Write a protein that binds this ligand. Structure first.
Ligand SMILES: O=C(CCc1ccc(O)cc1)c1c(O)cc(O)cc1O
Ligand SMILES: O=C(CCc1ccc(O)cc1)c1c(O)cc(O)cc1O
Ligand SMILES: O=C(CCc1ccc(O)cc1)c1c(O)cc(O)cc1O
Lengths: 205, 206
């Protein structure tokens, strides 16, 4: 029943503390098993290796925005740019309010080396950023098919400029919090990025 | 100063870069840097005390090819403080794609260098560096406003952060997926885009 299947969520949670205190590079399954109070067998039962766990920390970040995201990417949503505003606000709200989001992000950006002894962390990350880029592009097009964003704007590049700016901000708040009142000014910070996409001639063809 | 220790100093740094690049900054002992560099261990000890001193010196190295433009841009008597900043950003990107040395230290710094509350000096240094860099963009952005090169009521402080986030994230995306961003081919567009956001965006005002 309810045992074997709930251990999974207890393994992930211990994997987070372990990763947070020690770092991905130097943590081993064994470290996580002791923390979870299970055996390395219980772990191997849900996770073939340490890259799956990491992967699972990463795939957990998408859940809260899922719907707002899917909306932005829908060709039938009359407010696609407005949907991308609500998502960015939620990404930044979730970041400031949820200890758990803050720490998975803090693990991904500042613990977590790409080493060649375990290169699926890197491959997993590349691939994750491609799929997020493709999402942004469609949203970008959808707003353009709609008078919300300048016609024949460069999707691709705007997509990358947008990612760059948000990744870099998140990582910056993650380094210096008291230096960005990210919560008190979510609106300003989001629209700065929005203003770029819609006002930058360099982002045009 | 002494001519032997210089080459000696130079020979440890260079091999730290090679060493963090393969093994990363968490699982690399100053002893690895030994057998790789050649130099006897205790000298690596005369030279640097731990990891935070050495990692620090990789960062310190990065800044240098950009000294002149960055302090030009920051000078209050500089007639074109946005001009310098434009070129600076060009050099930075140009140097990233070209100089194998620069692309590597950046990879180390972004991708191979964990923060643990056990390796506090790595984080502490990082924080400090960004605050310094931050202190520069703001002065320059303030000199460009004054010159009437950036909108009048520009929020310099928020603006520097905005700019800072966009470049750091662009560098990292390029490291992560170079074949995605023709950083070298479209280099002018990438700079201008970030500059456009400083000048055009309403939200960065006041
Ligand atoms: O722009 C973003 C998210 C930006 C972002 C990427 C990574 C991250 O860590 C935080 C925020 C975005 C999507 O992703 C999906 C969408 O349908 C619309 C949309 O606007
Ligand atoms: O996967 C990432 C981080 C991407 C990234 C990792 C390393 C790097 O160097 C640059 C970018 C991520 C989040 O964290 C949060 C999101 O809502 C979406 C999202 O895609
Ligand atoms: O924007 C930057 C550097 C950004 C940056 C460079 C290298 C790097 O590795 C990461 C970020 C900058 C300064 O710092 C100081 C200035 O007076 C002007 C200026 O334009």
């Amino acid at each position: 029943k309810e045992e074997a299947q709930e251990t999974r969520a207890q393994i992930i949670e211990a994997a987070e503390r372990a990763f947070y205190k020690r770092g991905v590079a130097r943590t081993t399954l064994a470290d996580i098993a002791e923390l979870a109070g299970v055996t390395r067998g219980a772990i191997y039962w849900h996770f073939n290796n340490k890259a799956e766990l990491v992967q699972a920390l990463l795939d957990s970040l998408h859940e809260t925005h899922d719907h707002l995201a899917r909306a932005s990417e829908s060709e039938d949503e009359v407010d696609p740019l407005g949907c991308m505003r609500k998502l960015l606000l939620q990404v930044f709200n979730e970041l400031v309010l949820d200890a758990r989001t803050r720490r998975i992000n803090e693990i991904l950006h500042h613990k977590c080396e790409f080493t060649d002894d375990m290169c699926e962390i890197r491959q997993q990350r590349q691939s994750a950023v491609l799929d997020c880029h493709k999402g942004i592009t469609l949203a970008l097009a959808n707003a353009v098919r709609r008078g919300q964003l300048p016609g024949e704007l460069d999707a691709e590049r705007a997509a990358v400029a947008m990612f760059a700016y948000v990744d870099g901000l998140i990582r910056r708040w993650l380094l210096l919090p008291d230096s960005v009142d990210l919560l008190g000014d979510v609106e300003k910070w989001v629209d700065t990025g929005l203003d770029m996409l819609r006002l930058s001639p360099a982002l045009r063809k």
